[PDB]
């Protein structure tokens, strides 16, 4: 119902993936135009990069970008369930953003229904591909996935009408890194020599993941010396 609040604006670098979820965007906001034309789109977009890169994030601004519902699941959860609930909801999932349509699906670690983990597992696959080829041309719906090694993702998941398109994405770049950073270090109280700006500046090739570390790291280096701020020497040693 609530479209996100998050748009191309909030999302630092990816510029090169941005362009491509350009065309998906416009199918989000008109999907009548695209209709009229007799175009098509492929409904089934897998973005692909290392863990913590921000591609749910991206994804979730895609929704924001054409103002139309982010609705969410977890591919792991359903493998969690008894066997046979798993599906059920992957059924409820589409059946639900039917009824919501225009909007964007995100099935999150798509690896865990995709990857060879499993009864519950190959229910709740066999159910996501039926749903996906559940979709008429008239439908506006585009469902995002994210994964980090693609290769080892059942094939089916891939073939043309479904996951068919995939768009890299690659660790964030100095903006990226300074707002990952500025998050995480919400609640740590930091000293007045903390250049987060400069800490982004001198990390490339972080994920957010080293980033969220670093900062928990360096959150221990002063607690457990009994300080009440990290300061910017912590910073540089938890880093390493
Ligand atoms: N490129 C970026 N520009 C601005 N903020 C970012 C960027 N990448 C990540 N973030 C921030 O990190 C938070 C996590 O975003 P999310 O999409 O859930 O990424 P993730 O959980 O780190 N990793 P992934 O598994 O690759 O999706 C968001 O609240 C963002 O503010």
Redesign the pocket.
């Given at each position: 119902t609530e479209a996100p609040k998050v748009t191309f604006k909030?999302?630092?670098?990816?510029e090169e993936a941005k362009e491509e979820l350009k065309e998906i965007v416009e199918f989000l906001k008109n999907p009548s135009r695209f209709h009229e034309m007799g175009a098509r789109i492929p409904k089934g977009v897998l973005?692909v990069?290392?863990?913590?890169?921000?591609?749910?994030?991206?994804?979730?601004a895609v929704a924001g970008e054409a103002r139309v519902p982010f609705i969410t699941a977890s591919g792991s959860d359903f493998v969690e369930m008894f066997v046979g609930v798993g599906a059920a909801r992957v059924r409820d999932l589409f059946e639900t953003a039917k009824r919501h349509a225009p909007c964007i699906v995100f099935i999150?670690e798509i690896d865990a229904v995709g990857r060879k983990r499993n009864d519950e597992r190959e229910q709740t696959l066999n159910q996501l591909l039926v749903e996906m080829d559940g979709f008429e041309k008239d439908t506006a719906i585009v469902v995002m996935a994210?994964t980090?090694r693609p290769d080892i993702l059942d094939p089916a998941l891939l073939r043309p009408g479904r996951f068919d398109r995939q768009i890299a994405?690659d660790a964030?770049?100095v903006?990226?890194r300074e707002?990952?950073l500025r998050?995480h270090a919400r609640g740590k109280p930091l000293a007045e020599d903390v250049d987060l700006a400069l800490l982004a500046k001198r990390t490339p090739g972080f994920?957010?993941?080293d980033l969220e570390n670093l900062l928990n790291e360096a959150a221990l280096l002063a607690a457990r010396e009994g300080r009440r701020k990290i300061t910017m020497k912590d910073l540089e040693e938890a880093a390493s």
């Amino acid at each position: 119902t609530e479209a996100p609040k998050v748009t191309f604006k909030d999302v630092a670098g990816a510029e090169e993936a941005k362009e491509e979820l350009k065309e998906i965007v416009e199918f989000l906001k008109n999907p009548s135009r695209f209709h009229e034309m007799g175009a098509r789109i492929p409904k089934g977009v897998l973005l692909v990069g290392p863990p913590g890169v921000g591609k749910t994030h991206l994804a979730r601004a895609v929704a924001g970008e054409a103002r139309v519902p982010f609705i969410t699941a977890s591919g792991s959860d359903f493998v969690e369930m008894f066997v046979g609930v798993g599906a059920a909801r992957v059924r409820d999932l589409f059946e639900t953003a039917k009824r919501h349509a225009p909007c964007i699906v995100f099935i999150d670690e798509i690896d865990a229904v995709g990857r060879k983990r499993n009864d519950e597992r190959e229910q709740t696959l066999n159910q996501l591909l039926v749903e996906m080829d559940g979709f008429e041309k008239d439908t506006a719906i585009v469902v995002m996935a994210a994964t980090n090694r693609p290769d080892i993702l059942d094939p089916a998941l891939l073939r043309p009408g479904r996951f068919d398109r995939q768009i890299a994405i690659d660790a964030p770049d100095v903006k990226g890194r300074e707002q990952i950073l500025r998050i995480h270090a919400r609640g740590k109280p930091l000293a007045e020599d903390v250049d987060l700006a400069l800490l982004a500046k001198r990390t490339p090739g972080f994920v957010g993941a080293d980033l969220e570390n670093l900062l928990n790291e360096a959150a221990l280096l002063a607690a457990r010396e009994g300080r009440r701020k990290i300061t910017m020497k912590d910073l540089e040693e938890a880093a390493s």
